[PDB]
Design a protein around this ligand. Structure first.
Ligand code: U1H
Ligand code: U1H
Length: 330
């Protein structure tokens, strides 16, 4: 079987993408943030502290004839940006774009951090990293992808994120009409539970390609591109007036500048990120200082190929027994 769903940016900056997901019987449709950097499927629900809900659609297990409380199970998660949430666990039917999984763990949020409350467009997260990272205790639970794997025509999903435009998540097949040229596959390490791989180098604008190994994770749930301080300094040195701002928390640049492209290596192939993708607009309304989409990973501890990088490519997440990541231009 296969599934296909459209994913839509939540705002004019592509800060995140939401994808409709059907939960329960009859269906309750929630718009979830598909996150290849985590492994929990959690939702705002009728159980979420009332003051912590501000416009989100909530899941109501009591109105679902297929929902079952998973007795004794709890979950608690903390994201690299400091966000967190926690609650209890149901099992229910979950469908993404025609693809149905029965008995999926649906983690009902009883408490959510402020950054989730303020994001009215995101009803929850759908984790797509490896199931070793799932936070359900005392019995760890499988992701939606792991539960669907056997029924899929091919154990793959693909991410085709749009620049200021809708895109597509496909499960179980590779749309050969959605990319140009060939797909380049590269090895994945699952040892930290992430889709972790090694980029073969980079270039800034029309500059010389620098061959150097950059280990990092493919993370649809992270907005920006976080790379080592040496790489990030080389990029922003090519932008007149750009500087790192401690008060802002990253590189900023004059909103009147034009940004160079950024190229990253996948084996012998090159993915080019157009400079416009790196512009995240003024740091506050009316400011003439703009925030950069390439930032240092020094404070994070791991390099992150977030949406800025991924939306420049057609990306295959191959969950075969030896997992791989495929990248193609589009
Ligand atoms: N998108 C989920 C996510 C967020 C943060 C991290 C970090 F910070 F641990 F790298 C990994 C995965
Ligand atoms: N990387 C996971 C993640 C995704 C979104 C958010 C936000 F936007 F709600 F803060 C936090 C953490």
């Amino acid at each position: 079987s296969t599934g296909s769903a459209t994913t839509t940016p939540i705002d004019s900056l592509d800060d995140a993408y939401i994808t409709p997901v059907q939960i329960g019987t009859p269906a309750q449709t929630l718009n979830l943030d598909f996150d290849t950097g985590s492994s929990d499927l959690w939702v705002f629900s009728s159980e979420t502290t009332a003051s912590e809900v501000d416009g989100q659609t909530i899941y109501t297990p009591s109105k679902s004839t297929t929902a079952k409380l998973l007795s004794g199970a709890t979950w608690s998660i903390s994201y690299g940006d400091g966000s967190s949430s926690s609650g209890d666990v149901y099992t229910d039917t979950v469908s993404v774009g025609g693809l149905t999984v029965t008995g999926q763990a649906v983690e009902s949020a009883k408490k959510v951090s402020s950054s989730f409350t303020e994001d009215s467009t995101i009803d929850g997260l759908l984790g797509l990293a490896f199931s070793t990272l799932n936070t359900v205790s005392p019995t760890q639970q499988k992701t939606f992808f792991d539960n669907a794997k056997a029924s899929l025509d091919s154990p793959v999903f693909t991410a085709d994120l749009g620049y200021h435009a809708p895109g597509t998540y496909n499960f179980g097949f590779i749309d050969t009409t959605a990319y140009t040229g060939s797909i380049t596959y590269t090895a994945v390490s699952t040892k930290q539970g992430f889709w972790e791989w090694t980029s073969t180098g980079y270039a800034v604008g029309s500059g010389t390609f620098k061959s150097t190994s950059i280990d990092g994770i493919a993370d649809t749930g992270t907005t920006l591109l976080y790379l080592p301080a040496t790489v990030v300094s080389a990029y922003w040195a090519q932008v007149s007036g750009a500087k790192s701002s401690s008060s802002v928390g990253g590189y900023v640049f004059p909103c009147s500048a034009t940004l160079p492209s950024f190229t990253f290596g996948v084996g012998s192939a090159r993915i080019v990120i157009p400079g416009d993708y790196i512009d995240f607009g003024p740091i506050s309304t009316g400011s003439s200082s703009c925030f950069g989409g390439i930032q240092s990973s020094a404070g994070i501890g791991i390099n992150i190929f977030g949406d800025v990088a991924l939306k420049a490519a057609f990306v295959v997440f191959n969950g075969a027994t030896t997992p791989t990541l495929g990248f193609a231009s589009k």
